Structures are given as structure tokens and as C-alpha cells.
Amino acid sequence: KSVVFVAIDLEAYELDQSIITEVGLAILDTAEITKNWFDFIKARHIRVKEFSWAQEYFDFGESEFIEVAKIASVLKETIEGKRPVVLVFHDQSQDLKYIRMLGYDVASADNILEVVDTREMYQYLSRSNNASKLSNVCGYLDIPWNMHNAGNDAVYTLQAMMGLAIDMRQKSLE
Amino acid sequence: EKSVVFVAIDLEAYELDQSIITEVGLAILDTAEITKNWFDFIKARHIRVKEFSWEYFDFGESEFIEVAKIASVLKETIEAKRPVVLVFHDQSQDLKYIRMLGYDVASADNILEVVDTREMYQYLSRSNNASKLSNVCGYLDIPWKNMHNAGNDAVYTLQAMMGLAIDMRQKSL
Ligand SMILES: [Ca+2]
Ligand SMILES: [Ca+2]
Ligand SMILES: [Ca+2]
Ligand SMILES: [Ca+2]
Known part of the structure; x- marks a missing residue:
């Protein structure tokens, strides 16, 4: 038995709410621990490459830049899978x-x-x-x-x- | 710098006699040590209480201390x-x-x-x-x-x- 936990956060531009600028992903695959859970958390920060001008670093890896048209397939x-x-x-x-x-x-x-x-x-x-x-x-x-x-x-x-x-x-x- | 020490505590008593203390669990987080990531600064201790001085612990090595010294440790x-x-x-x-x-x-x-x-x-x-x-x-x-x-x-x-x-x-x- 296995379950994949996926935490997601997205941000939109303050001055234009039609623009999605970044995607935050935090994955925990229990199959990868089936014994110290927080070490197995896979995090990704995705900056939308067309909108990186629309405005912090990433403390759990390196920020990725991906084109808007490729974001959906990544998600x-x-x-x-x-x-x-x-x-x-x-x-x-x-x-x-x-x-x-x-x-x-x-x-x-x-x-x-x-x-x-x-x-x-x-x-x-x-x-x-x-x-x-x-x-x-x-x-x-x-x-x-x-x-x-x-x-x-x-x-x-x-x-x-x-x-x-x-x-x-x-x-x-207990 | 304002700081707070978080101390998580658990004690275990003998199964057949709740007057007998067998284990003490301590987990400390000093916020002054982060002012990496917070859980990396967690200091854990496992103390098995021996009555007389002459499963396992996954976050360090178990200590053995006599009952008479436990209070001062806490x-x-x-x-x-x-x-x-x-x-x-x-x-x-x-x-x-x-x-x-x-x-x-x-x-x-x-x-x-x-x-x-x-x-x-x-x-x-x-x-x-x-x-x-x-x-x-x-x-x-x-x-x-x-x-x-x-x-x-x-x-x-x-x-x-x-x-x-x-x-x-x-x-x-
Ligand atoms: Ca959110
Ligand atoms: Ca958000
Ligand atoms: Ca308890
Ligand atoms: Ca207990």
C-alpha cells in the first residue's frame, strides 16, 4: 500500500491577477519510506519563465524556470505520473x-x-x-x-x- | 534577541507498577539557535532510569541515570x-x-x-x-x-x- 502526498501553492501577480507567476510543490511518497519521513520530502519551486519580472529564493532546492505552456504537463x-x-x-x-x-x-x-x-x-x-x-x-x-x-x-x-x-x-x- | 526554549517531555512507568519510572524522554528546541531548518536543531535525549548506581532510541544513544539524579537533570x-x-x-x-x-x-x-x-x-x-x-x-x-x-x-x-x-x-x- 502506498499514497503520494502532494502539497501545492501558487501565486498570482498583485497588479494583474490573470498572471500566475510561481508554483510550489512539496511531495511525500510513502512508498519511498515503506523510516525518517521529513528527509524524504521532495520540494520544487517553479518560476513561470514568461513572468519572472512580475513581482525571495528557494530554501529547499533551486528555483526552476519553465515556460507557461509546459507548466500543465509538469503538474x-x-x-x-x-x-x-x-x-x-x-x-x-x-x-x-x-x-x-x-x-x-x-x-x-x-x-x-x-x-x-x-x-x-x-x-x-x-x-x-x-x-x-x-x-x-x-x-x-x-x-x-x-x-x-x-x-x-x-x-x-x-x-x-x-x-x-x-x-x-x-x-x-499508545 | 528574544528567545524561547521548547521542551517536549515524556516519561514512562513500569507496566505493573506506576510508581516505578523507567524512561524519560526529552526533546529540546532552542529558538536562539536559529536566530539550516528548525527540525535540524532539535536536541533529543533518552534516559533509562536505573534504580541503583554502582524499543530502541532512533534519535541518539540512550543514557542510563540513577533515580536520585533524574530530578536535577530535568x-x-x-x-x-x-x-x-x-x-x-x-x-x-x-x-x-x-x-x-x-x-x-x-x-x-x-x-x-x-x-x-x-x-x-x-x-x-x-x-x-x-x-x-x-x-x-x-x-x-x-x-x-x-x-x-x-x-x-x-x-x-x-x-x-x-x-x-x-x-x-x-x-x-
Ligand atoms: Ca495557498
Ligand atoms: Ca499563494
Ligand atoms: Ca506522555
Ligand atoms: Ca509515556
Whole structure:
């Protein structure tokens, strides 16, 4: 049994929302660990080569430059290669729009097992005691985070959910 | 430079006698050490408690320390100076064990926050997205060896909360 976790983030130009400028991908193939999960996270930052003027580096690899016409096939290869895929988003509606605008048809993919939106879970956690504590500590620290990079955005999203999922599982078995 | 020390703790008691402490798990993250990537700066310790001085641990080598010295080890870890965030799973049980070792963590005045993941997971039990992850992990049924190891238990606890806290912060900005 194997599942491919795919975290995705896309950015659009501030002054022209029809222009998609970067794609962040963070992949975790459980088949590659079936024992230290975060070492097996494959991250990619894709800068749209036609729109690199439309305006941070990539902290988990080297940023790629790809033409807009080639982006869709890259996304299709990532998601469809068919092995079951779990999509992880923050703000699912916004990112699904951006993916469509790049020429990829998510609906065509028959191998999507689940879609996870952290924006829902974090909203849900907004009235959580322990979650609020963590926020206060991070708010106190005011840590300055390279920060708009879609590649980083996707990695942090995947690490957060995988770390949470693994822990909840292990603690439930004991 | 403002800094906080995150300390994840797990203790284990003997199966047949909950008065006998057998293991202590510590996972430390000093934010001052990042002010690479955050999880690379996590310092883990596994202590098997020997009663007298004359599975495995996947994040280092297990230490052997006598019961009489454990309290000071914990106190040194927590304490005094810099603010400490305590991270537990089942806070009451672990605080009990520590007290029985002669150290009163609650007495420590440098405690900024105390986080109990067992509460959050209870709260997340009726979460839509959390349930999705659970079903996938239940299907995969990935076998993690040495899951009862108190050292590993603390590392997974800290990684889960730090990864969650960092992400929640960045996405809110
Ligand atoms: Ca984005
Ligand atoms: Ca997003
Ligand atoms: Ca324990
Ligand atoms: Ca515990």
C-alpha cells in the first residue's frame, strides 16, 4: 500500500491577477519510506519563465524556470505520473483556480483520494486552547521568516500536516 | 534577541507498577539557535532510569541515570533566565511522574506556556481535515518500530507542534 502526498501553492501577480507567476510543490511518497519521513520530502519551486519580472529564493532546492505552456504537463506528471494522491492546500478554492489557469484539469485526474485544506483546519483550531497558546508564543517571538516563496509555502504546509498526522496516529496506538 | 526554549517531555512507568519510572524522554528546541531548518536543531535525549548506581532510541544513544539524579537533570533542562514552553502528551500523567522524581515543574517560574497535545487531538477528533489524514494513515498502516520509546515519543510530539505552530503563523501573515 502506498499514497503520494502532494502539497501545492501558487501565486498570482498583485497588479494583474490573470498572471500566475510561481508554483510550489512539496511531495511525500510513502512508498519511498515503506523510516525518517521529513528527509524524504521532495520540494520544487517553479518560476513561470514568461513572468519572472512580475513581482525571495528557494530554501529547499533551486528555483526552476519553465515556460507557461509546459507548466500543465509538469503538474500532470506530478499528480498523475495511477497511484492514489492526497492533495494538500491552504485556501483550496484559490489554488484550484490558479491550477486551472495554468492549463491543468484537476477534475480529469481520477486518482485523487483526498483533498486537505489547512485553512479550514486552522479556522477550526482558532477556538482551541493549545493552538491559541502556540500562537501567543509565536506572536511573542515575532520570528522573521525568503517568505513569499511558493516553494517554501508548500513545504511548511506539508511538514505541518504530516507531522500532525503521524503524531496523532502514533499517540493513538499508545 | 528574544528567545524561547521548547521542551517536549515524556516519561514512562513500569507496566505493573506506576510508581516505578523507567524512561524519560526529552526533546529540546532552542529558538536562539536559529536566530539550516528548525527540525535540524532539535536536541533529543533518552534516559533509562536505573534504580541503583554502582524499543530502541532512533534519535541518539540512550543514557542510563540513577533515580536520585533524574530530578536535577530535568531541573537543569527547564531551569531561571530564559522562558520555557512545555509540550506534553497527557499532561497530568507526565507531571505526576516528574513529581514522583522529586521535581516540581509547576514551581518553575520561567514557564511561558504549557501545551497538551492530548487535548488538541481530542478537539481535533471532530475535525473534517484531521479525520481525512487519520483515514489515510489508518489505511497505510505504516509500522513504526520503537513507538513506545519515551525519547522518540517526545521528538514526534515536538515536531508535530513546532511544524503546526510555524505553519499557522506564516499562513496568518
Ligand atoms: Ca499563494
Ligand atoms: Ca495557498
Ligand atoms: Ca509515556
Ligand atoms: Ca506522555
